[PDB]
């Protein structure tokens, strides 16, 4: 995932739906580093 | 608190025109420096615009 | 129904509406008609439908007793037949009409507990079960049925009697009318089939508009309140000038031959004899009330002459429902319900310790 | 003038948000046709406090 | 009519999961403590004192917000009689106000240094919520972690 | 950004990219008194999901 | 009372007229007693008795300037008042002359040279 | 990890030269007006950067709480390195940087902070710009002091210039810059450079820089209302001119007596 959305966030030829798309997918992950970053206290 | 620059950011840049006209302006008195404080109220920045703006209705007293 | 249920009778003059309380309508309703021929012993739609070989009498006509076997038997018609209930495990509710005597609610006590001997009752006035429908303590409530009319202030709850108008009116009366009036421009009416569908057509398809004159001088010109009408009978009669202009005796009185005050007179006067400090009160929440709802559109007339009345740099509050013929029903649906009307009901100890006038103190 | 009697109900909608009520759209869509019969909203308060209390009991 | 507005408010209050029963018998409650009230100075001032517990507690153009707004309503009477009655009853930045770079003839007063201190809070409110969220994420868990088994599962106690 | 781009074609409004997320293919310089008849074509792949294909062919 | 009603009872204090009539001037009260309402400046209450002893040398009336010491020496003997600054500054801010200029006359610290 | 980080630092070092470089006079009008509307990001960075070391000591921030924390900063302060480097990478004053963030005003909006920021930056931008708007449109000379205007003034009229050699002023001294158009006034720009010339002949015996607008010209995306101030000045420009010159100094008595 993080593979896919920084390839096509360097695009500007993806387009202002991809760069939506992109959006969504860039909220969704950074809820997933919230969880690591709690995770990384208790370590 | 970063070495206190949070407090010190606009600063100088303020202090920055208050210097400039004083060395851009020297040896200059009577209407030879108001040909000269006029030639800063043709800036972009309000921030400078705003200050000269001042400066010059002090000096048109 | 949710907790220990009860029984709401609503014994009136157009018809009798019963059912356990805590049902938004009632579980049944019937016409207000008693039996023995002019069936055998019978009150509901079959004596309604032989009329013609029975005698109709109401027992509450105007708030008097015509005869006792009378309100015996369409009371013992309406507990037995039209509901079919134990009277041990309900408790009645009964209702009379705003300004009642005393003596009249010992009598009605004294038949309940009589013939069927139940171990609680209760008796209510029929505009604080209008009033409590309309969630408030406070109100003035113009009933107008077809037997009975009553411009009736309610004030913490408790309707003054002194206050309240009593005014004659009676749906017969209308019926009486239309039969003069109909003779009066040439038509057979000596029966009693007529008469049902000369009710029917008042009830249903007469019209009233918000002002009284320019549909009057339009449908004088050109009659455009006129439908044609084919009943499954294959009689046709029609006229819409005429079926308007009969009820103008809620503006002028005269105009059906009534001796007492038309209508918008009536609250005009009966707000004249109330208190200067309870006026506003009264007008806070102002309601329309009565039987006159079965044909819709009356209403807004009603709301005018009410808005007439009072002034206009008052802004009106007026509580104004759809429907407002199961006033009293709804009354007792919704108070019965509630445990805190269980202090004010009445049970057989008081009845027997105290003799019947506890009843007119407990209930009320 | 539907259009009118909507646009000031969404200017009274803001105002109880404003000062954190707990009335949504159609508890004030309720409540402004109940007052408009002339109910009085002194008691209103009191009801809508205790129903929101009874309600939690039920979950 | 009337009646059935009551339990329309009665639904309102009740979100959506006996259930429809529970909802006649609130209807009681409702009724009960309507008449609580009926057995036991403009409107406008009444604004005045509340956009003063505003003004007080800072925050001034939202005070001349509420009092713009109530000024076209007061151009449904009886409704903000109500609403002065339940406040708190519910649940318990733009670059143009503290910046002289922009604008287009931007008036001068200076610094002012005391909204930027609440500029620090405005940092530290942000920071007070992603530190609740690492409050929130390490308790939820420590409450099912620790037990005797069979307290996080219903179908172990049957 | 699909409904953006129908707010340049249920008003006036032509499309621009040179990367196509809507359907319309205008034909440059054909623009002339004659333009009601084809000069934008319905392009298959930038159609939507949540309309049908009466209601992308009446929108041009 | 709260204060939020105490100016109005100001406002109905002065206004013999009542509060439903006059509610513009509540108003304008409102915004201005409101966002500038506990002290924010340096109190002191020598300077402001010494400004009392100034208001009471333009009249040139030198004796009620000495009785003025023994009223402002009993406000501090009881101490029963939270802000002895505020009404002194009050009561000379509202004197009234029978029968001049503060730009040369030095005021007290604001605390915006010092942090809130 | 450390190297997952530093995109945030790169485009930080980028804009702070820039913002001093371009805040001197001879980087445009306009380039001075953007300079100072990136540095109210920088307020927040600085702080948050601050905050965040005062935090650590106790040791309740560390470096994956970091990297957590700055996810939104890493879109926003991103984007203005770009900008920046574009505005860089073809060198543009004035107007034709007034078509470059038009052109950023669209590339980006489903971000929804890197389309906020420019939306921002566009109606900072376009404060001196319409400023010389303000006074070409209502009177009839430039005060301009750059020549980075989509107008520019030239002079045909002259002490040693007659009327026999400059025919009508229509010929040259009146022309539109090439790339200082905004490149969303181009369907206006024609009447723009119409207008002001309307105004000076009335200036020029008269005085006349009223009209009936008299109003700031804003920009917003999306908007056009700096369209239509623009359409109902030209029209009494024109029409004080042409009721101006058919009454003194007329064609009807010339024509005539031609």
Not at chain 3, 289 to 296: A, I, L, Q, R, V
Not at chain 3, 320 to 349: C, D
Not at chain 8, 190 to 205: A, F, W
């Given at each position: 995932?993080?593979r896919?959305?920084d390839?096509?966030?360097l695009?500007?030829?993806?387009g ?7 959006a969504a997918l ?6 997933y580093?919230?969880?690591?970053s709690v995770?990384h206290?208790?370590? | 608190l970063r070495?206190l620059?949070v407090?010190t950011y606009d600063?100088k840049?303020?202090?920055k025109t ?5 060395d851009?302006?020297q040896?200059?008195?009577?209407g030879?420096?108001?040909s000269?404080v006029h030639?800063?109220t043709?800036?972009?920045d309000?921030?400078?615009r705003?200050?000269?703006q001042?400066i010059?209705?002090?000096?048109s007293? | 129904?949710?907790?220990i249920?009860?029984l709401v009778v ?10 356990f309380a805590?049902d938004?309508?009632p579980?049944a309703?019937?016409?207000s ?7 055998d012993?019978?009150?509901?739609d079959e004596?309604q439908?032989?009329?013609?070989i029975?005698?109709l009498?109401?027992?509450?006509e105007?708030?008097?007793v015509?005869n006792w076997?009378?309100?015996?038997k369409?009371w013992?018609?309406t507990?037995?037949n039209?509901?079919?209930?134990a009277?041990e495990?309900?408790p009645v ?12 609610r010992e009598?009605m006590?004294?038949?309940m507990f009589?013939?069927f ?26 009933d107008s049925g ?13 309707a003054?009697?002194?206050?309240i108008?009593?005014l004659?009116?009676?749906?017969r009366?209308?019926t ?6 109909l003779?009066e421009?040439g038509y057979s009416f000596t ?22 004159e320019?549909e009057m ?5 050109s009659?455009?309140?006129?439908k ?8 046709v ?9 009969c ?7 005269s105009?059906?031959?009534?001796e007492?005050?038309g209508i ?7 707000i004249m ?5 309870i006026?506003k009160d009264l007008?806070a929440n102002?309601v ?6 079965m044909y ?8 005018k002459?009410?808005?007439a009345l009072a002034p206009?740099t008052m ?5 104004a429902?759809?429907e407002?013929?199961?006033?009293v ?7 019965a ?6 202090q004010?009901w ?5 009845y027997?310790?105290?003799?019947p006038?506890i009843v007119?103190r407990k209930?009320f | 003038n539907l259009n009118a ?7 009274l ?7 954190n009520?707990?009335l949504?759209?159609?508890t004030?869509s ?6 408009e019969?002339?109910?009085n909203?002194?008691?209103?308060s009191?009801?809508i406090?205790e ?5 939690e009991?039920?979950? | 009519?009337?009646?059935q507005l009551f339990?329309?408010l009665?639904e ?6 006996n259930?429809?029963?529970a909802?006649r018998?609130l209807k009681?409650?409702?009724y ?5 009230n009926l057995?036991?100075?403009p ?16 925050l001034?153009?939202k005070?001349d917000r509420?009092e713009?707004?109530?000024e076209?309503?007061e151009?449904?009477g009886?409704?903000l009689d109500?609403?002065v ?9 733009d670059?143009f106000?503290?910046n002289?770079?922009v ?16 500029f620090?809070?405005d940092?530290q409110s942000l920071i007070?919520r992603?530190?609740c969220?690492?409050h929130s994420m390490?308790?939820?868990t420590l409450q099912?972690?620790?037990a005797?088994?069979?307290?996080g599962?219903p179908t172990?106690?049957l | 950004?699909?409904l953006?781009?129908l707010?340049?074609?249920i008003?006036?409004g032509?499309?621009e990219?040179?990367y196509?997320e ?5 034909d440059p310089?054909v623009?002339?008194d004659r333009?009601?008849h084809?000069k934008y074509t319905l392009?298959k792949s ?5 309309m049908?294909?009466?209601q992308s062919?009446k929108v041009? | 009372?709260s204060?939020?009603?105490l ?5 109905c204090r002065?206004?013999?007229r009542?509060e439903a009539?006059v509610?513009?001037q509540?108003?304008?009260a409102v915004r201005?007693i ?5 002290p924010?400046?340096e ?6 008795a010494?400004k009392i002893?100034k ?8 004796a ?7 009223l402002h020496?009993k406000?501090?003997?009881?101490g029963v008042?939270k802000?002895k600054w505020?009404?002194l500054?009050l009561?000379?801010?509202?004197s009234?002359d ?6 040369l006359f030095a005021?007290?610290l604001?605390?915006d040279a010092?942090?809130? | ?5 530093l995109p945030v630092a ?8 820039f ?5 001197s006079?001879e980087?445009?009008?306009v ?7 990136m ?7 600085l702080?948050?950067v601050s905050q965040?070391?005062?935090?650590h000591?106790?040791?309740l921030?560390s470096l994956?709480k970091?990297?957590?924390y700055?996810q939104?900063?890493?879109r926003?302060?991103?984007?203005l390195?770009?900008?920046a480097?574009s ?13 470059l963030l038009?052109d950023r ?7 929804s902070?890197?389309q ?9 931008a376009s404060a001196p710009?319409?400023e010389?708007?303000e ?16 107008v ?5 009229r ?7 050699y ?10 539109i810059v090439?790339?200082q158009?905004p490149?969303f006034?181009?369907?206006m720009?024609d009447k ?7 105004l000076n ?15 700031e010209?804003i ?7 700096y369209?239509?101030?623009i359409?109902?000045?030209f029209?009494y420009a024109?029409?004080?001119?042409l ?16």
């Amino acid at each position: 995932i993080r593979r896919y959305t920084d390839q096509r966030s360097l695009d500007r030829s993806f387009g202002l739906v991809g760069q939506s798309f992109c959006a969504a997918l860039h909220q969704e992950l950074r809820e997933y580093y919230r969880l690591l970053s709690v995770l990384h206290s208790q370590l | 608190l970063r070495r206190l620059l949070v407090w010190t950011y606009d600063p100088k840049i303020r202090l920055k025109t208050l210097a400039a006209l004083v060395d851009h302006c020297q040896g200059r008195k009577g209407g030879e420096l108001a040909s000269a404080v006029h030639a800063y109220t043709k800036t972009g920045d309000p921030y400078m615009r705003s200050l000269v703006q001042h400066i010059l209705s002090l000096v048109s007293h | 129904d949710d907790d220990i249920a009860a029984l709401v009778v609503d014994n009136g003059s157009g018809m009798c509406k019963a059912g356990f309380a805590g049902d938004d309508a009632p579980r049944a309703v019937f016409p207000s008609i008693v039996g023995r021929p002019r069936k055998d012993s019978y009150v509901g739609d079959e004596a309604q439908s032989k009329r013609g070989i029975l005698t109709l009498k109401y027992p509450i006509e105007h708030g008097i007793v015509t005869n006792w076997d009378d309100m015996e038997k369409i009371w013992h018609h309406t507990f037995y037949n039209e509901l079919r209930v134990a009277p041990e495990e309900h408790p009645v509710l009964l209702t009379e009409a705003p300004l009642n005597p005393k003596a009249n609610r010992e009598k009605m006590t004294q038949i309940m507990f009589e013939t069927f001997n139940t171990p609680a009752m209760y008796v209510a006035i029929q505009a604080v079960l209008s009033l409590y429908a309309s969630g408030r303590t406070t109100g003035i409530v113009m009933d107008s049925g077809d037997g009975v009319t009553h411009t009736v202030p309610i004030y913490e709850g408790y309707a003054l009697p002194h206050a309240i108008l009593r005014l004659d009116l009676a749906g017969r009366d209308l019926t009486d009318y239309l039969m003069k009036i109909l003779t009066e421009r040439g038509y057979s009416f000596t029966t009693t089939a007529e008469r049902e569908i000369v009710r029917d057509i008042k009830e249903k398809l007469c019209y009233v508009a918000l002002d009284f004159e320019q549909e009057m001088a339009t449908a004088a010109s050109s009659s455009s309140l006129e439908k044609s009408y084919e009943l499954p009978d294959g009689q046709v009669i029609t006229i819409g000038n005429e079926r308007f202009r009969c009820p103008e005796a809620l503006f002028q009185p005269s105009f059906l031959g009534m001796e007492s005050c038309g209508i918008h007179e009536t609250t005009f006067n009966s707000i004249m004899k109330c208190d200067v400090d309870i006026r506003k009160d009264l007008y806070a929440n102002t309601v329309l009330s009565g039987g006159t709802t079965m044909y819709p559109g009356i209403a807004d007339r009603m709301q005018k002459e009410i808005t007439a009345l009072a002034p206009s740099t008052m802004k009106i509050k007026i509580i104004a429902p759809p429907e407002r013929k199961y006033s009293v029903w709804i009354g007792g649906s919704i108070l019965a319900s509630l445990s805190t009307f269980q202090q004010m009901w009445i049970s057989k100890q008081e009845y027997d310790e105290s003799g019947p006038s506890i009843v007119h103190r407990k209930c009320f | 003038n539907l259009n009118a009697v909507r646009e000031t109900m969404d200017v009274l909608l803001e105002i109880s948000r404003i000062l954190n009520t707990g009335l949504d759209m159609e508890t004030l869509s309720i409540c402004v046709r109940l007052c408009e019969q002339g109910i009085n909203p002194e008691a209103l308060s009191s009801v809508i406090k205790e129903l929101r209390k009874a309600t939690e009991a039920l979950k | 009519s009337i009646t059935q507005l009551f339990d329309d408010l009665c639904e309102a209050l009740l979100p959506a999961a006996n259930r429809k029963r529970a909802k006649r018998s609130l209807k009681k409650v409702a009724y009960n403590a309507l008449f609580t009230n009926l057995f036991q100075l403009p409107a406008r001032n009444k604004i005045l004192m509340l956009s003063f517990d505003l003004r007080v507690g800072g925050l001034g153009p939202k005070a001349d917000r509420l009092e713009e707004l109530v000024e076209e309503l007061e151009a449904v009477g009886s409704v903000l009689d109500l609403l002065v009655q339940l406040a708190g009853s519910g649940p318990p930045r733009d670059y143009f106000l503290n910046n002289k770079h922009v604008g287009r003839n931007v008036p001068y007063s200076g610094y002012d240094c005391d909204d930027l201190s609440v500029f620090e809070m405005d940092v530290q409110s942000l920071i007070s919520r992603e530190e609740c969220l690492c409050h929130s994420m390490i308790q939820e868990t420590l409450q099912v972690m620790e037990a005797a088994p069979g307290t996080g599962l219903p179908t172990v106690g049957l | 950004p699909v409904l953006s781009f129908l707010y340049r074609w249920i008003y006036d409004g032509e499309l621009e990219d040179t990367y196509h997320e809507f359907f319309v293919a205008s034909d440059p310089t054909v623009k002339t008194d004659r333009l009601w008849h084809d000069k934008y074509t319905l392009r298959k792949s930038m159609i939507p999901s949540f309309m049908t294909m009466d209601q992308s062919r009446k929108v041009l | 009372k709260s204060p939020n009603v105490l100016l109005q009872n100001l406002c109905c204090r002065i206004l013999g007229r009542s509060e439903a009539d006059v509610a513009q001037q509540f108003q304008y009260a409102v915004r201005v007693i409101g966002s500038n309402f506990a002290p924010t400046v340096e109190r002191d209450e020598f300077l402001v008795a010494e400004k009392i002893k100034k208001e009471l040398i333009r009249q040139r009336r030198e004796a009620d300037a000495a009785l003025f010491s023994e009223l402002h020496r009993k406000l501090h003997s009881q101490g029963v008042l939270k802000n002895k600054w505020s009404i002194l500054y009050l009561l000379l801010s509202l004197s009234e002359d029978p029968r001049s200029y503060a730009t040369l006359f030095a005021q007290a610290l604001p605390r915006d040279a010092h942090s809130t | 990890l450390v190297h997952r980080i530093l995109p945030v630092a790169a485009s930080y070092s980028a804009v702070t030269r820039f913002i001093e470089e371009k805040s001197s006079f001879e980087y445009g009008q306009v380039n001075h007006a953007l300079a100072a509307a990136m540095r109210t990001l920088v307020k927040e960075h600085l702080i948050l950067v601050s905050q965040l070391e005062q935090l650590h000591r106790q040791g309740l921030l560390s470096l994956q709480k970091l990297w957590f924390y700055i996810q939104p900063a890493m879109r926003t302060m991103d984007i203005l390195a770009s900008l920046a480097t574009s505005v860089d990478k073809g060198e543009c004053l004035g107007g034709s940087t007034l078509s470059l963030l038009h052109d950023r005003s669209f590339s980006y909006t489903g971000d929804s902070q890197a389309q906020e920021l420019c939306l921002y930056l566009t109606k900072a931008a376009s404060a001196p710009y319409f400023e010389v708007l303000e006074k070409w449109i209502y009177r009839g000379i430039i005060h301009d002091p750059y020549s980075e205007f989509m107008v520019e003034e030239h002079e045909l009229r002259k002490e040693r210039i007659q009327e026999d050699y400059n025919d009508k002023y229509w010929d040259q001294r009146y022309t539109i810059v090439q790339q200082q158009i905004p490149s969303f006034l181009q369907k206006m720009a024609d009447k723009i450079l119409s207008t002001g010339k309307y105004l000076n002949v009335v200036r020029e015996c008269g005085h006349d820089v009223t009209c009936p607008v008299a109003k700031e010209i804003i920009y917003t995306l999306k908007e056009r209302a700096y369209v239509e101030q623009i359409e109902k000045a030209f029209n009494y420009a024109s029409k004080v001119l042409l009721d101006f010159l058919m009454e003194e100094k007329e064609l009807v008595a010339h024509l005539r007596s031609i």
